[PDB]
Symmetry: D2
Subunit: 250 residues, 4 copies
């Protein structure tokens, strides 16, 4: 039984693949531009992935890996009335590049289900792109498409830490993504049956992608303060979670 595990509490540039604006300053993973004044910049795009690829399904054995991630992220907008665009946890082909700038989160191209990009994402959306987005701020599960397969309402607590837990099991295939805001004592959850064999290639890079506005004044920070991940691929023909969550939060 193959295992892979890491937990962050402070970040480093060395054990990550950093694309575009993604920078590590003062131990924090800043996926988008943050100037030498403390101001978020619009038009910024960035990607951060773990240096070691992960096997999420095996063809010759037929088994799918069961994984889980947990990260504390902070979105700080000077104007909560004009924010864009958000951040997402993603699984993408090992050396795959970011795509469209802004509301596409540097992950997808269009609203259609296109498995040439082979990208599963869990988005945290703070802007109404409308044609594919629901009314307000939302957590969405993305499958080859920026038009989320399922979405849940999100009371976006600006400038406040957001603690996420995303879990995938092999017997249930239910990709579950939750978010808590301890300062506002709130909690939200998304759950949909996703199958990784059909969508993602055998080996992927896990990590993050975040963007800012296509406008001039649509600015926010998109920081990750900590990150845990663990995966287990069963050999021949459930996983332990409880022990995973504390590993980072606790």
């Amino acid at each position: 039984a193959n295992l892979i595990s890491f937990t962050f509490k402070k970040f480093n540039e060395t054990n990550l693949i950093l694309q575009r604006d993604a920078t590590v300053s003062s131990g924090k993973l800043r996926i988008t531009k943050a100037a030498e004044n403390g101001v978020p910049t619009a038009g910024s795009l960035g990607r951060a992935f773990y240096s070691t690829p992960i096997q999420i399904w095996d063809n010759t054995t037929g088994t799918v890996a069961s994984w889980a991630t947990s990260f504390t992220f902070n979105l700080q907008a000077p104007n909560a009335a004009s924010p864009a665009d958000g951040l997402a946890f993603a699984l993408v082909p090992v050396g795959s590049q970011p795509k469209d700038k802004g509301g596409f989160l540097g992950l997808f191209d269009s609203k259609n289900y296109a498995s040439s990009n082979q990208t599963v994402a869990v988005e945290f959306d703070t802007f109404y792109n409308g044609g594919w987005d629901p009314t307000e701020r939302h957590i969405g599960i993305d499958v080859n498409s920026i038009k989320s397969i399922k979405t849940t309402s999100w009371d976006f607590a600006n400038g406040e830490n957001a603690e996420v837990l995303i879990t995938y099991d092999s017997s249930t295939n239910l990709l579950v993504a939750s978010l808590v805001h301890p300062s506002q004592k709130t909690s939200f959850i998304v759950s949909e049956r996703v199958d990784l064999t059909s969508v993602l290639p055998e080996w992927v890079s896990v990590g993050f992608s975040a963007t800012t506005g296509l406008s001039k004044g649509y600015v926010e920070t998109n920081e990750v303060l900590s990150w845990s991940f663990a995966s287990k691929l069963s050999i021949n023909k459930e996983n332990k979670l409880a022990i995973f969550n504390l590993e980072g939060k606790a």
Copy 2:
């Protein structure tokens, strides 16, 4: 950091304690004294707990423990229109016997707030009382008493497998409780910040407290398929978060 953990996928009496009306047999944890036919009996009080007491907060350093738990439970009633009452993931004192049955869920004596009780539990309510309860079916936390302050909405599933995740964080005192239906997708979550140094004592028996009503018309069951738990007691003024990504994979995944 003092650690304690375990993962049940097949239960045993040898590593479980019983109180009042509990029973452990046949590959699963049937907390209510179930007859051969499958009959829920009213006027009961099931109490299954792990043998080791689990430390919540230290005196010598003054550090709170962060814990996590995951279990797969079912609430089954032959009549859906009359369900009472359900169970609650209890953290009761070791040197304390179960209390009043029914609405009090075998945990408390009175509806009023009293620190003498020393019991925090995550309920999976089914019956409408209202004197200490909200509007309908609810998943909530019980602090020092049976009367809640904030709960969540939850549709009452009948004869459905549900996987539960409950966690506590020392840094923010936040107790987060979730519940997922693999088949129905009906996933719900609740969170609330309550200080446990003021409420709970130092050592508690952790497990499942089950109960029924005072009438045969309102009857239901209490069953657990698999159980997991972890706890972490921080050393010297940490106020940090425990790992959770690796935990849920131990039991559930």
Copy 3:
């Protein structure tokens, strides 16, 4: 797969089974008695076990558990030329009482093969008994007897920390025991095949046993400063090998 683990970087009473002279003093498991002036006492016997019975083999499936323990102990003798008798990690029946003191270490009655004792022990022996002992300080594997089935040489450093690791890989049926004195850069290792199915019962108590000498001059402390444990019992297949790597970091540091 059923699992059970704990890490005691500091000790407490409520999760242990203390027998005879074993006490928890200021976070330390002081197994044998010490005077209010810091003076070790002769004719002492002490036992401390984990409050949860640990299943090391299943009868209904024929599967054997894989388990691992680590602990740091410290044997502080007023004089090095007169020490006795040592301490041991042992697996014993759930309700087992302390046996003979001294050279028997509270675990055994004789040097002959006593199958009814049902005890596997890893001894850290600081007294040459001759009736069974090798000539110098030694680690031994004890199967239903104080006459060790195998031994190795232990260059014991008086009053210095001993870092111990004991693993049992069920598939190979091999028990391996190692001791490290980090102050002197010394290391020792013992390994021998032991079949748990015919020696030990299904459920066991896991912990410690220690004694001082039977003469007033031959005295020592037998303290355990920290103790971590892990066990993984499979469902139907014989077993899967345990992950030792992440153990110490999460257990011993």
Copy 4:
């Protein structure tokens, strides 16, 4: 504290840095070359390192990591009269390329102390080499030289699995290595203090390195069947060996 772990009970090319003759064959790491029919080739060298760099020590804080690695290997020589050379678990610089083959195990160049190497290794040596080696088969601790600063005896059994555990306790500076031949009940151990802040860079790649004999007769299989590892680096300011040696090594 930051944590990093993995368990390889079955190997893959995707999460390893393969160098020279080392390759994954049927889910096993064959470090030196071996024919389809089983016979190993002479004069070979192989290396395998994990994809993500591991932080052993931190410059500004002074804080040093505690790590533990467990692996099972199999050394099978067609003839016990002519075996060479051996395998080692080593920590090297990030962009480290293989050095001198044969007796130097692909980790060193000369018998003298050279700092430019920045390499800490645990050798398992089956050939009595020249100006460095002790009289019999031996485990060794290699600190910037093929001449081990401390060795212990190792009764090697041809073609029998060897279970290895290596640990580093930061607070005592102690590196401990153990080898067990479970098939014949034998066990071996060595321990020596090593200052890794003097020797190793802040970031190191961990893994293996093995060589076959520089003469045509001196052949052996240099196989690694499983490999588990974990590291723990604190934030400000010991590892549970119980759980590790299992979850990973079982």
